[PDB]
Curated annotation (Swiss-Prot), chains B, C, D:
Coiled-coil parts of chain: 1-24
Protein name, entry field: Fusion glycoprotein F1
Origin: domain of life: Viruses
């Protein structure tokens, strides 16, 4: 029974949004200081 | 304030990198939805 | 530096244009996924 | 101009809030596509 | 047969993009001043 | 019952176009800051 798996795309998307969260927190911290 | 201008430049550089990451996340989402369509059709 | 201030204004306006384009792409991705759901159900 | 600097900071902090909203939209789109995959394989 | 319903996620995504639209409008009109 | 293929290409093509527009605007933003 073959199956649908777009997991490698969704995982890379999740990784990129996690990286974007860290960069935004860093941007905010640069302005505050 | 020169330090205020420096902080804007460093912040905007970092903000541009955050946007690029979200753009890349978007490209991956397009590939994922195209993979769902291909699986359904083929 | 007046010119440093001018450069930030020009860059941030361009960055905001990039974010608008990403936001519009997101709206299209939402339409695509709703299209897949409508196809499956209807 | 201190006022041009204040204005740049206000614009960029608001830009950063817009990007965070788009990032959270992207999280929901991933959950939606995983939902479509799980439905298809079920 | 089961109905597919990812409407809650797509609804939240729509809301977040509408919030981003209002914030980008605000940023553009601060920067113009 | 659908006898036709699924096609959300109109939406995915527009999404691609907007993300490419954004990529090039982000290069321009980077260029303006360097100069």
């Amino acid at each position: 029974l073959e199956r649908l798996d777009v997991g490698t795309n969704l995982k890379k998307a999740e990784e990129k949004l996690k990286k974007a969260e860290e960069l935004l927190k860093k941007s905010e911290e640069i302005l505050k200081k | 304030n020169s330090q205020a201008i420096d902080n804007l430049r460093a912040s905007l550089e970092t903000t541009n990198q955050a946007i690029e990451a979200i753009r890349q996340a978007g490209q991956e989402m397009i590939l994922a939805v195209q993979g769902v369509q291909d699986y359904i059709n083929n």
